[PDB]
Each structure stands twice: as C-alpha cells, then as structure tokens.
Amino acid sequence: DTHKVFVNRIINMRKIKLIGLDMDHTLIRYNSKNFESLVYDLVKERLAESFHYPEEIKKFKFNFDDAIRGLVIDSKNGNILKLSRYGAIRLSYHGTKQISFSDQKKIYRSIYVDLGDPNYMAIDTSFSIAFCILYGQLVDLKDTNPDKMPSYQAIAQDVQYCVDKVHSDGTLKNIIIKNLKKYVIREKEVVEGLKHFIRYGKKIFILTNSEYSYSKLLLDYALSPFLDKGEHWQGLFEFVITLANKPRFFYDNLRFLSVNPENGTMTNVHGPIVPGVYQGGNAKKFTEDLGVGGDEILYIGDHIYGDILRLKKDCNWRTALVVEELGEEIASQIRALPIEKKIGEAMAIKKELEQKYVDLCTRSIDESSQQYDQEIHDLQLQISTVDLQISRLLQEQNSFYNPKWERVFRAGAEESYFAYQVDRFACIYMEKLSDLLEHSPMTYFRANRRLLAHDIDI
Amino acid sequence: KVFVNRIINMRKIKLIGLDMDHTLIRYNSKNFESLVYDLVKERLAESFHYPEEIKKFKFNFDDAIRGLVIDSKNGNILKLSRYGAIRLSYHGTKQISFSDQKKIYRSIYVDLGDPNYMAIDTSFSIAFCILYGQLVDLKDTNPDKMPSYQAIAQDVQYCVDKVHSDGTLKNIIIKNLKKYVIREKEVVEGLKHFIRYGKKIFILTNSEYSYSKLLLDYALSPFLDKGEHWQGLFEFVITLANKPRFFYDNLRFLSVNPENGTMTNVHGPIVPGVYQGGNAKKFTEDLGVGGDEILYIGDHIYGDILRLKKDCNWRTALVVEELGEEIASQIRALPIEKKIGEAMAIKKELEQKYVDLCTRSIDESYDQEIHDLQLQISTVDLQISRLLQEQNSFYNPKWERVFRAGAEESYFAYQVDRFACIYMEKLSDLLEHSPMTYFRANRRLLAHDIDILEH
Amino acid sequence: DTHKVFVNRIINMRKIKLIGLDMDHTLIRYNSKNFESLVYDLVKERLAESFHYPEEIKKFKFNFDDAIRGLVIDSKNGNILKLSRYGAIRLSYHGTKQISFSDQKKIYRSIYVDLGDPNYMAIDTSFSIAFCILYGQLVDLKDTNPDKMPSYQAIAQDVQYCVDKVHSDGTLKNIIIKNLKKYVIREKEVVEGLKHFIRYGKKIFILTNSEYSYSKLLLDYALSPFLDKGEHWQGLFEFVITLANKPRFFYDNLRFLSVNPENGTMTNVHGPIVPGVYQGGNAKKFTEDLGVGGDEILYIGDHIYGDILRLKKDCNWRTALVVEELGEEIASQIRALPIEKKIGEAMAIKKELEQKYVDLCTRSIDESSQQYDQEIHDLQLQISTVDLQISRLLQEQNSFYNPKWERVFRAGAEESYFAYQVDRFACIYMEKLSDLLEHSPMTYFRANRRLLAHDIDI
Amino acid sequence: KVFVNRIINMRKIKLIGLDMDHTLIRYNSKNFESLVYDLVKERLAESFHYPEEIKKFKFNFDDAIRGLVIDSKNGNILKLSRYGAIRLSYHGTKQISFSDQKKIYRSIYVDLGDPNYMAIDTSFSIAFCILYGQLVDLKDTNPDKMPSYQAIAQDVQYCVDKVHSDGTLKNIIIKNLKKYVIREKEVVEGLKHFIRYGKKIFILTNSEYSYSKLLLDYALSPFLDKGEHWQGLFEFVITLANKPRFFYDNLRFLSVNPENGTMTNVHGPIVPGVYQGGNAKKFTEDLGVGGDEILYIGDHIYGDILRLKKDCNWRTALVVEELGEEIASQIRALPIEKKIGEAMAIKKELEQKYVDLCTRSIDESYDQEIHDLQLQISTVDLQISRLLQEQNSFYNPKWERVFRAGAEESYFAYQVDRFACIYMEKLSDLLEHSPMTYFRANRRLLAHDIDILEH
Numbered sequence A, C: 001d002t003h004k005v006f007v008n009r010i011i012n013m014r015k016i017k018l019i020g021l022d023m024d025h026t027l028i029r030y031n032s033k034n035f036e037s038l039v040y041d042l043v044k045e046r047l048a049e050s051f052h053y054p055e056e057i058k059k060f061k062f063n064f065d066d067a068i069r070g071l072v073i074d075s076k077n078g079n080i081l082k083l084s085r086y087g088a089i090r091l092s093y094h095g096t097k098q099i100s101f102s103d104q105k106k107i108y109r110s111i112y113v114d115l116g117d118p119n120y121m122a123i124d125t126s127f128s129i130a131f132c133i134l135y136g137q138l139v140d141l142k143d144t145n146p147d148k149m150p151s152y153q154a155i156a157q158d159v160q161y162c163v164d165k166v167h168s169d170g171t172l173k174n175i176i177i178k179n180l181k182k183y184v185i186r187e188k189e190v191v192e193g194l195k196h197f198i199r200y201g202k203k204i205f206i207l208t209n210s211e212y213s214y215s216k217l218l219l220d221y222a223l224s225p226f227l228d229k230g231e232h233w234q235g236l237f238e239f240v241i242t243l244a245n246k247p248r249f250f251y252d253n254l255r256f257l258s259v260n261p262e263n264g265t266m267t268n269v270h271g272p273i274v275p276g277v278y279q280g281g282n283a284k285k286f287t288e289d290l291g292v293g294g295d296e297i298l299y300i301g302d303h304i305y306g307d308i309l310r311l312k313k314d315c316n317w318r319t320a321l322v323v324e325e326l327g328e329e330i331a332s333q334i335r336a337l338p339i340e341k342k343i344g345e346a347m348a349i350k351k352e353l354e355q356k357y358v359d360l361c362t363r364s365i366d367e368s369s370q371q372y373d374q375e376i377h378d379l380q381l382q383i384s385t386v387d388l389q390i391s392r393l394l395q396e397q398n399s400f401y402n403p404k405w406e407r408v409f410r411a412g413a414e415e416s417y418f419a420y421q422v423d424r425f426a427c428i429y430m431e432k433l434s435d436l437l438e439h440s441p442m443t444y445f446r447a448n449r450r451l452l453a454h455d456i457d458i
Numbered sequence B, D: 001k002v003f004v005n006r007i008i009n010m011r012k013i014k015l016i017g018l019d020m021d022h023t024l025i026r027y028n029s030k031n032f033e034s035l036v037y038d039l040v041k042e043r044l045a046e047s048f049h050y051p052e053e054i055k056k057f058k059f060n061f062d063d064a065i066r067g068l069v070i071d072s073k074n075g076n077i078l079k080l081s082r083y084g085a086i087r088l089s090y091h092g093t094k095q096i097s098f099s100d101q102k103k104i105y106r107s108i109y110v111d112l113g114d115p116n117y118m119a120i121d122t123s124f125s126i127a128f129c130i131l132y133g134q135l136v137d138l139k140d141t142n143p144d145k146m147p148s149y150q151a152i153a154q155d156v157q158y159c160v161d162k163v164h165s166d167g168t169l170k171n172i173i174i175k176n177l178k179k180y181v182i183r184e185k186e187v188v189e190g191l192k193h194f195i196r197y198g199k200k201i202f203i204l205t206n207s208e209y210s211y212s213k214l215l216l217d218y219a220l221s222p223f224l225d226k227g228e229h230w231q232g233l234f235e236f237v238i239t240l241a242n243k244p245r246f247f248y249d250n251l252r253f254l255s256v257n258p259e260n261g262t263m264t265n266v267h268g269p270i271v272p273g274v275y276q277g278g279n280a281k282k283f284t285e286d287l288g289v290g291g292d293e294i295l296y297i298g299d300h301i302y303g304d305i306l307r308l309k310k311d312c313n314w315r316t317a318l319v320v321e322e323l324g325e326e327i328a329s330q331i332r333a334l335p336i337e338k339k340i341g342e343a344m345a346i347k348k349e350l351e352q353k354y355v356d357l358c359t360r361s362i363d364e365s366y367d368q369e370i371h372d373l374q375l376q377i378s379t380v381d382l383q384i385s386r387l388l389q390e391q392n393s394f395y396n397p398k399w400e401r402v403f404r405a406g407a408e409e410s411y412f413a414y415q416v417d418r419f420a421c422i423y424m425e426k427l428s429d430l431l432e433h434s435p436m437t438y439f440r441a442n443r444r445l446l447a448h449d450i451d452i453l454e455h
C-alpha cells in the first residue's frame, strides 16, 4: 500500500488547524459494489411501486461495470455521455446501445455540450453509477413500447425522485444497519491515522448528512474495534455535525441545533457553538465561532457537491477529495504500462514518418520535381503499416479499462470532464482517507508542473 | 514555433480568416500602447474634466502585464489562476497584503460572471491597467474630486471606445505608419505559399475599409511585384466585421464597391470581394463548406469564449505576441527549473520512505528515524520554495509570468488552452510551416502517466 | 366611424415633437385574412420542401377563425393556451382538440404558467394567428404517426424557422408586390391625417423593417393617390428609416447607413443624421442627433416587440399601438350588449340570493334553530334556477365571439395575457392609425380610473 | 370590509394559516415603527461607528409611505407605478426635479431585477425609508465620513436584520406589551366561530416559540374563559417558520415539546402540536388536502411573488393596515372624485364632437367651429388636472396614496392584486364574516364594458 496523495494545488498542512471529515464514504468506507447494488434495487423497486412503471423493470439486472463514474445524463434525449474537460463528447450511448460518430453529430450538431443547460444532469454522487445503469435500461424499455413509459426527460426526473426518497425514507439506512458487515469496511489504519494527526495538535470534526442516531451506530461499529481499552471514539472528534445538509451547509445560512448526546433531543443554539454534537448549521458560523481563518480548515469529501463555483465562492475552506475509483484506475494503468510504452514508441515513429513525408511532399511541390516521388510512395505505405500497428495496440490498451467507457480521468488523450471537476474542487485527492492520514500532519503539498505546450520539456 | 492544444490538419482547412490589426499586420506594441495611453488620459481630462494632474502621469510599459483583471468596485487589479483564484493583487500601484486581501475578499475566488469585474483581453489591456492604477493611485489623495473606483473604470472604458471610433487613434497612426506598423516580408511570402496550395485567405477586421486599404497597401505591397495588387492575396475582405457578434450573431452583409466605397444590400450568396458587417453563419454556408474547414486567427480573446465556441464551430487560432519574452525568460530560467525538478524528485523519494515507515509502525505497532526523515523533507522543501523565488526574477518583477498564476496556470493560460487549437508568437510562424502540415497536440499527458511505473 | 382612441396612460400630444410610424400594418393597412393566408401557405410550403415533412401537410386547409390573437404556444407539449394577465390558463388545446379541465391540471400541475420558461412561445407578431393554426394541425398529424414527424418542440422551431425565412426570402414581398390591390388597403383619411398633424408642426418619420426598394413602392401605391397634383409622398416624412431591425433598433447600437434615394446605394454615416432615407440605425443616436428628449417622440406599431421590459427600459420613447382586431371585438361586444346586460341583472339577483342564503344558514347554525329551514331550502332551488338561467345566458354570450377562444382582451372575467401586454406597452391604442390622426395633434390623453376593489363606485 | 381580487369559497377552505406578528396579533404601528427606528440608528452609531450626529435624527412617521423603493446606488427613494415607472422621486428628504430625474435615470422605468434596488415590503419599510433618507441627507455634508450611498443602505439592512435576531427588539416589546401590542376581543371570537364551523387554524410565524407563547397569552387569553387555553384555538403552531422559504423550499420540520421547548427530528407525518421550521409541501401532504383548501394570511408580501405563487399553490390573503387611512381619505375626497368623473364625461363628449367634425371635413373637404371646440376641450382639461391636484391634499403630502402612483395603480397595488385573493385592513374583518361565505370579485370589469353602448 503506497498511500499516494495527488496534489493539484499547494496546501500547507502545517497551517491547517481543523480537518472536517465527511462520514459516509470518506471517514467510513463502504463496499462500493454492494452499496451501489442496494441503491439500484431500492430505487428500481420504488419505481415499480410508487410510480407504476412496467412490471418488466423488476426483471432488470444490475451489472456494476455497465457504467463508470463521471458520466453525464442527457435527459432530453435519453442518452449518457463521456465528456472531456471542456465538454467535448468523447463517446455516447442511447440507453445501452452506443451511438455512432455519424449519428452523434446529427443529434448534437456540435462536439461540445453546454452543461449550463438544465437538460443535462452532471451531478457527482454516490449513486451516479447506479443512476446511469438504471436510466440506460429504462430508456431501452421505453423504446420498445414508447407509450407504456413516460418521456426520457420524465424518466430521469422520476428516477432522481426515487433516489432522493430512498435517501430520506431511511429504507437504505435500516438495510445497511441490519447488515453492517456486508456494507461497511473496517480499517485499523484510519483510527491510527486520526490519532496520529490529533497527536500533533490537529482538531478533527465530522460533517455528515446522516442523522446522529445513525452516525453514532456506524462510528462505533467502524472505529471502536481499534481503540485502546477505555477510549471512546468520541475523543477522536472535536465536533460532530449531523444532518449537515451539504452543500448548503457550506454556503447557506441554516441554523445549528445542539444535540443531547444521550437521548438525542435538540435545543436551538444561542451564542457560539462549543465542542459537542450538533445538527444542521453553516460554515460561516462554524468558522467564526472557532475564531480561525477559513483557509485554516480542510474539509474532505467523496463526491463533488454539484456547482464547484458557488461553493468555492461563498465558503473559502480548503477542500480535498477521496476518489474510491482511483483504486482500479491505477491498477489498470499499471497493467497497461507495457502497452502504453509500446504505443508511445509507435507514435514517435509515426510522427517521425509523417514529418519527413510532409516535407518531402512540399519539396516536390515547391520544387516542381518528381525525384522524391519514389520515397514519398514508400513513406505512404510505411505510415499505413505503423498506423495499423497502433490502431491495434490501442484496441489492446482498451481491454485494460471498462469496455464501454474507458478511463474515469481520461476522455481520449485529454482529461475527462470528471477529471476537471476533481482538479477544480480538490487541492489534493487520494483513493482513501488513510492515504492522507499516513502522511505527516505537517506535510507541505506541492503540485508537479503541468507543462504548457510552449514549455520546454526537461 | 507553433504550439498545439488540439489537432488540426491543415490539409483539411480550405479557408484561413485573418484578423487585420495585430495579427496579419504587426504593430510596434510599445509605441501603440502608449499612443492609446496618451489619447485616453487626454480624453479624460477633457470630456470628463479629470484633475489636470493626470497629464503628468508617465507610461511604463512594464507596470502591467497581459491577462490581468480589473476590480472596478474596489479599484484593484487582480491576477487570477485558471479557476478564478486571486494569486496576486494590487490597489492602484500598491500591492495588497496577504492579510489585507483576506479582509477585502471573503473568498480567494472571484466570479467573473459579476459584471463588476473587467476581464476583457484587448490590445489595450496593458494601457488600461497602468492608467487605471495611477488614476486610483492619485484618487485617494482626495476622494471628492475623481469619481468612484467603479465610475473611473467605466469612464476610462468609454474613452478607449470613443477614441477608437472618433478616428482619433486611426488618424494618428495613418499619418505616421513608419512609427507604428512593422513590415515583414515573411508574411506575404507565407500567404502566397498557402494560396499556392489551394488555401483561400480572407480578412476579418473591426476596422473601416478606408483605413484597411491604407494599412494593407503600406504593409504588404512593398513585398509585391510591380502590378501585383495586395488585394489579390485575399479571396474576401470583410470590414467593420463587428466582432465578436460577427461570429454568433446574425447581422447582414453589405457589398462594398472597392472603387467609390458606397455599399449595396446583399441578395443571394456572397462572392469574392469586399464586404462590411456580416456573420459567420451566412459566410460558411455561402462558401459551401463546414465550419471545421475554416481557420480563423486573431490576437485577442474577444468576449465570452463559450458563446463564441458553442455557436461558431470554426477552428480558431491565436497569435500571442507576449510569447517572445515569456519564452526567452523561461529559457534563461531553464537551469533553475531543472534544479526544482530534481528537488521535487528527491522530495517524493523521501516522503515515500516516510509514509512507508509511518505505515510500517502500524503493521507492528524506530521513533526517531522518522524525525531525521521529516528534517530532510523540511530542508528540501525550503530549497524548493527559495528556488521558485529565485526563478521570479527572470520575469516581470511586478506580476510574474503571463501563463502562470503562482504555481498554477493563469486564467489567461486557460483561455488560450480553451480558445486556441494552435497558438504562436506571430502569424508568420504558422505561415512558415508547410500548407499541408498536420499539427498534433503534445503527448505530454501520455508520458505524464509514466508516474504509473513509479509503482 | 367613431375613430376612438383608448388610453392606458397620460400622453400630452402637445409635447410630442416627432411621431415614428411602423410601415407594414400601421401606416399602410393590409387585408388581414388574405395576408395571414399567404403567410400560412408560404410557410406550409417551405416545410414540405426544405424540411421534408409528410406530403399530407400540403392538404392542410386554412381557416382564419381556428385561432385568435394573443395565444401562447407550449412547444414542449404541442399545446396552445389562452392566458390571463397573470398567466392563468383560461383554456387550452392540444392541436385542434380541446383539453378538458381535468387533463389540464394533470399536464400543468398548476393553473399558472411561467412565460419566463423558454418552452413557451408568446411573441405577438403579424403571423401569430397563422402560426397557431398551422402548429395546431401539425401536432394533429404528428399524433397520427408519431414517427413520420419530429417532436412537438422540433415542429414549433421548424415552423418558426420557415416564418423567419419566408420573411427574408423576399418570397412574401414579391407576391404582395405583384398583387397589391389584393393585399394592401388604401385609405384617404391616413393622408389627410398626416397632413393634419404636419400642419400643426408635427414631424413624422417612418421606421420599418422592410427594405427601401419595397417601401418606396408601397408608400407610393398607398399614399400618392390622395396627394394634390405635384405633391410627393416623401414630403409627408422627415425621415424614413428602413431595415430598421426592430426591436433591436430601440435598444441595440447598430449603425445607420445613408441611402441614396435614387439608386439605393448606401454610405456609412459620419456625424449627425439629417432628414432623408436611411437603413438600420438605433434609437439612441436618432434621438441625440435630433436634439430632443426621448419622451418627445411617439412610436406607433402594430405588434408587441417580444420583451416589453428590455425595450421600455433602454429606450424611453413613448410607445403607442394599433390593434387591427379591435374592429371585430368592439363589433361583437355591441352585438352582445343586450345579453351582457341580461347576464348582469341575473348575476345581481344571484348574489342577492346567495347572501341571504349564507346569512340564513349561519343563523340556523349560530342560533341552533330550524325555523329558517323552510326558507333555506327554497333559496337553494331558486339559486339552482337562476344558476341555470345564467349558465345558458353565458353559452349564448359565447356565440358572439370566436367559438374556440372567446375574446382577445378577456380571459374569463379578467384580462387576457394579451390585454396585459397591450396595457404595459401602449400608452394608447386604437384599431387603426387614422383613428389617432383624426384627433387633435394637441390632445391631452387621460385614462379613466380603473377602480380598485377597495375603491367606492360612483 | 373584505376586498376581493379573486374568487374564494370559504366552504372549501379546511385550514387557515395565520401570520402571527402584525396579522393575528396587532401592534401599535406608530410605536413599533419608532422602536425599530431607534434600535437601528442606535446599532449604526456603534457596530459601524456612524457620525454621532445621527442620534439627533427625529422620527416622523409621515415622512415615508408603504410601497416605496430604495435606490441604493443613487441614494434615492422611488414610488413606482405597477409597471416600474418612476412617478415620484426623492434624494434623501429632497424631492428630485422632473428635469434632474431625467439626467439620473435614462428611462423612467427601473428594473427591480437589478439587486441594486431594495423593493421588499416589510413591517419596517417605513422606518427604513425615513432613516435612510436622513442618513443620505446628512451624508452629502461630508462624503468622506459616512460610506457610499449603496454602502449605507446595506448597513442599515444589516442592523434591522441583526436587531431582529439579537432579541433586542423582542425583549423590549416583551417587557412592555401594553405599549406595543393591541388586544381585540373580536379576533378570538371570530377564530372560535370559524373553529365552530370545522375550520382548522394554525400559526406560521418567523418568531421563536418562547416569544410566541408570551405574546399569544397576552393578546388572546384575556378573551378566554377560565381554564380555556389559547393553544386550543390552534391545530398547529409552527415557529421559526423561516418564511418565505417555508413556502417553496424543503427545510425540515422539528417537533417542539411544549413543555421544555427541546426538539426532536420528525419521522412520519406531522400531527397537531408545536413545530419549528418545516415547509408548505410536507404540511399540505401530511394533512391530506389540496393546496387550494388552505388559506394563508400574512401582512407583508415577503420576497418574489412569482416564486411564491408558482411553487406554493396555497390560497393567500393579505392584511394591509394602511387601508384604514387610505379609505377614510378617499371618502373625504369623494366629492372631488365625483367632479373629476363628470368633467371626464364632458371631455369625452366634446372630443367626440371634435373628431366628428374633423372627420366630417374629409367626407366633404366651418373651420372655426372646431376652434371654439378645441377651446372648450382645453378648459375642461385644465379643470381636470387642477381637480386631481385638489385631490392630492387629502393624502400623504409627500408621497400621495399607497395604491396609486400618479394616475396609475402603484407597484404595491399590483403586488396586492397579484398576491392576494382577498385583502382587508385587519384580520378580524375577515373573521367577522360567515365561515361559509363565498367571496366574489367585483364585476367592475363587467360594467366596465358598458362603454360599448356609448356606440
């Protein structure tokens, strides 16, 4: 376990006084497949029941790999898109069927899409992958008998409704509570890590959207097992804020509620908040009452809270991210190394051949001569041969990543739209929290130069 | 020579549209900037009765840099990162303190959507900043004379716009072409080379035709055989294009009689000749080609890129004159960079050995060995930040590099990346290449992921 | 001919120096039915040709009364709506079929619609009625074989495209030019009226979206016939601005072009514009160069230029309106007078009976008595009888107006959304220009009190 | 008594939701306005160090009127027509000249969409205007002390908001209930009457519960038999409702223990009792009724009406205290109105005879007969405008009527028309009517179209 932390922007951990941790999926790890699957089932169920959809949907099978993180839903046309950082359509599907390059240009009349347009759903959530798989299948069925089901737009909204409902019903909560060892992953390192950081004067607080009754259970289940006899998980946290109501917690002005740690009853807050348990709240008041600078607080989450601008504009806290999927992406890039290198040597040669060819052709034209005509014809075949070697090497490279969508962070040779989001929202990111907590709580994180096209390589 | 952001096969390009002022025709920046600088302060202490003392203000080309943003509300000039983060700020000529900055701006990120910020890349951006700075500099000395910070900014803008239409600016440079425009044989040769390869070239300028004729004759003719008319270099010459709107709007074309200058309304498709106004839509269709077969080259990112790239579809390239100095300076700082690279690598090696031990104390619950390691980390870090500081002296002393905002790329760098498929210092750099060249984006991100073998 | 001018807001004609006249449909009258029909044909044609729509559309028949002015198109659901001034749905149709009250609530989940939403098309134009009739029929056909035709949204946009095209092709212009006596109505009064106003020192200018070559023809054809031997229609106008490009002419900054009245060639303008012919332009410069106050200029048009706010915000000219349809509305309200009165006497009685009934019932309940039980039962039947008399009188009142849409200015008992537009954009309005020109060019126009619910009637 | 804009059959209303402060519970406006007035100026010359001289400022209830709008940018107070046209303006306490107005504002129409204008109808609107006026009044006497026009406005707002949460305002009125709140037996009787008819009443206040108990006990109990608790008058009592958001947002409900005040999160539907927060959506569903069966009555048009009427669906009524004076004054001016009506009728008769002759000179191409007619027109017009002027003395001398902006209805009048189905001077006016009454909008538009017989 390398425990690597990737840096997008400088952050001096030495100057960070408080570290705010998201609970579900950040501080406490969940079995992604099992959890996505549950959400899929609960959501698919709520559709056939409270929305009266074809009895056929209950038959839908869930396959984790049918979708990947970072995808965008075009509710208008019932399509799913893989975008580049600037919104360029790398690839698209209508339901499960992949759209061809030709038909793509017919539909979008451009290569770029405007995420500003409300028709597109591009929210990074813990249920995005399930959303995509389900939505895909739903439109596949809607195409069979385009009367038995609502419109593409309507379906997407219904599904979103169920997801929000299932996340409020408590139906999801109760099921994972009754099956904790199947859903939550325990990790000694996390506890050691927190202790490490606290040991150096760091203050750690929890900022979750789950209610306290649920957080008390889960925190106990996942942390206590690694605490010394007598210790209490509560000693690890300065504050524990529940039903935080993020992202609004960061930019809105909802009030704090003091929670009685025993029974759970609450009282309105008057004056500054003091170490303890709370509900709701807002970053503004939290930062003021702790008498510190916003940039002295680091919040770590697992998914981007919709609009990065509105959030980084009215908050000012340092934000970091945990991206669970980095696990397999890295594992896959390593398994593809030899091919990645092969593709590099091949491209090098290709561009070599191409330059020589360009110049020879312009010489024959500039010089009005036919002496290069022989060589030019060979370069042509030769380039046709390497172009073939490469095209095949590429297909080979694809087998190391998700067959339908390729990499989470790459949209062709450039960054995926999700890559941009990560870059804009997170100063640093890692596959999991213990990756960060294994570093020095004094670490000065810097980013390796990104190199501009006019920059000289070294 | 030519930097690639996105692929573009010149073999597929059928038409190359060129911006006239500052793209096809080069100007002596220093000279031009000052002229506009003088004409604006001059127009201020007149059509606005500004304190006669401003006439005393001197122009120092290096007081501002390209890419800066003006905060009219607070009378500040900001250098934002690609994501809108303030990485260097000033109030007039005074650099705002790290602490002072915190009080003025709640967040370090500004919203350029707020019309209060002036974030327009123009050929007079530098002059604008320099002046606006001194104006506010000698505005706090009596906040009862000169209007509000935001008022001043709006006035200065009005002067630049008026002086650009009064003909005040054009008339001066037209009566002293030798002092403002620079001739370059290469430009005409390259154009003829591309035309020899089937390319159709056309001009798309915001300037009037009468002015265009004078400038084009002066700058291109000296490189044209006897009887060879510069107009033969261009398939179409569109004047008073009214960009950016020309690109996404629907204003109509006016046919211009090259002789008397008079104009007639257009009926039917346009044909090779001189026009006024127009819009990219009608042009593309009239030429029966796809937008991706047209390459437009300008010098400034006029307006909102998204509206211009979503509604146009034309390939767009950019000429960025400031590259000359930026490159040279980076070439001088090259040895420092190399040093910073080595230290980062040694830093990575040490921080990894650190986490290994720190992670090795959990797989078996040697407490000082870590300490000496932390110590080394701290030392190489200190060396790194001092190295970056050392590097700052090779660039504009007041605002640093144009493409970098602190360690990150600047907002301007982002704009170039997003707006331009290829960019160069000057137009002849592109025209020097073969008309059938295939530009490929650096596989920098390819070798970038070599960090995978580190594992 | 009463020549009535309706006043929404005070306007002192004495203080008005320049009167700007819209040409097509304001200064020059057109035969509405014939003109709408032409637009319908040309637009329906352009669809089956450049858009490849079912060959069946060519069969579509045009009936002027199938639609009325002021309607709103819900492109999203292929529906046409009659709105109240606050956006309340008075009545709706899906194509030609009328939607029931029940299904209406199903579709809109409210009684109010947000015109702000881009899905609704609510632009008042000279081709709105044709647009509605055509769109209605198109969706009717789209429902037959929902595959042979685009989506409701797509159809509405295609149709709009054709309308704009046909208005630029010049196809419409050439046809009316070759048939002037079938399309344009001549009226001596207009000419006398202009002379009247000019006689009193009023300056009159034309502001049309048509090009000069066409305006010169039409103005000559429709005005000359009433000019004294030797006079020239051009003497009636101070300025004549063509290809004005409204509404943008009012708020944008497009430049003026000087037009050579003989040949038509143009030159860019430098300095102030002087009496003569022009192309393009903008209100700002026009008002400045004439050295007058914007409120000293009155512009009269025939249709509301989309957004009333953006226009009245950046212009400041007094705006008046000519509403051709007032002709039949007034004619119909007069033919309905006796019934309107009958409905009034009946409602009076009804509310009389209802009050007595309300009070008797609350007395029996407040007093816990059964002595009023007899009377209350009679009031019930009696009210049931008058309620029936009225319901029938109403149905009778409907036969005086368009069967599908009722009145242009009324949406039930309240004002129609179109009524609001007229009220917000026009300080005064009349059925036709000569109505205004027949008044004193010194007339001080005032509005009759509108009476607020708390206002005492006199 | 009760004015109807839109139909509402009380037989169909199942629940009546009431605003507490200024709706269910009446306050002595004069007193209350001044208290807030004093607390704000007090908080200004303290948390903002404003010129000690402001403490000298006196409060004159008649210096402002309801419905006015504040132009923070230019430090002005405007009275707009229903369409946003300025029909009366002031800079501080100084009435802006017709000409001066023209220079400041390009158009006579303002865009209330521009966040620069403060157009919020609150129970302290009057105090806000009066103070803000004097502040700018004694701000131009030294534009170096007190911040910018727009700054001042934003500060004053902060004080009003803080003083409303510091508890500063609540504490004062709670310790002197007799001086601020007014008791009214009628209110309790009517409530009980409606409850006797099946109606369910509930409170929806932005105030805290502790404060609510004190105020409700003081104002309702004195009219309740021994052992009859005011809380029995209400099915639900929702506190810290956080309106307007309560109506269109999705904030959660908190169950309040009437005893200790502590709260618990809500699971399942709500039941009769005390709550905090919440949203109209969950409330309506939990009660298993349609929005149109709920009537909410407030005293101020909180926020954007469109967002509140499009996303809510509840029937909304409004209590407008200023009606008392407005009506009385109109009743006094009644004889003038009658006169104006007669002259308008004589004007119409004459202008028609005018056009007839003018139209009769074209049907046969008597030139002075018209002249004498024009003369009469002019005379009756003069009489009309002088009559309207005569009428202005019966209303606020500085701002005229609340519902009229010049001759047109004011922006406030529009808001009432759009937001309220029925409106009254005070709540008991509605409660006085039978619980099964059917309110019908005046058939004024019906008899309005009698102008058709004129033909």
Ligand SMILES: Nc1nc2c(ncn2[C@@H]2O[C@H](COP(=O)(O)O)[C@@H](O)[C@H]2O)c(=O)[nH]1
Binding pocket: A085, A086, A115, A420, B082, B083, B084, B112, B113, B304, B305, B306, B414
């Ligand atoms: N500022 C910035 N915006 C980006 C970048 N990559 C993509 N974007 C897009 O730019 C959008 C905002 O548009 P802008 O205000 O820059 O015109 C963002 O919401 C995002 O969708 C980037 O690197 N920098």
Ligand SMILES: Nc1nc2c(ncn2[C@@H]2O[C@H](COP(=O)(O)O)[C@@H](O)[C@H]2O)c(=O)[nH]1
Binding pocket: C085, C086, C115, C420, D082, D083, D084, D112, D113, D304, D305, D306, D414
């Ligand atoms: N100001 C105003 N707006 C109205 C009236 N009747 C309808 N409206 C609607 O109000 C809209 C603007 O929303 P507002 O800014 O008033 O919230 C207008 O575009 C129009 O659709 C009216 O009498 N006055």
Ligand SMILES: [Mg+2]
Binding pocket: A022, A023, A024, A025, A026, A301, A302, A303
């Ligand atoms: Mg989480």
Ligand SMILES: [Mg+2]
Binding pocket: C022, C023, C024, C025, C026, C301, C302, C303
């Ligand atoms: Mg017209």
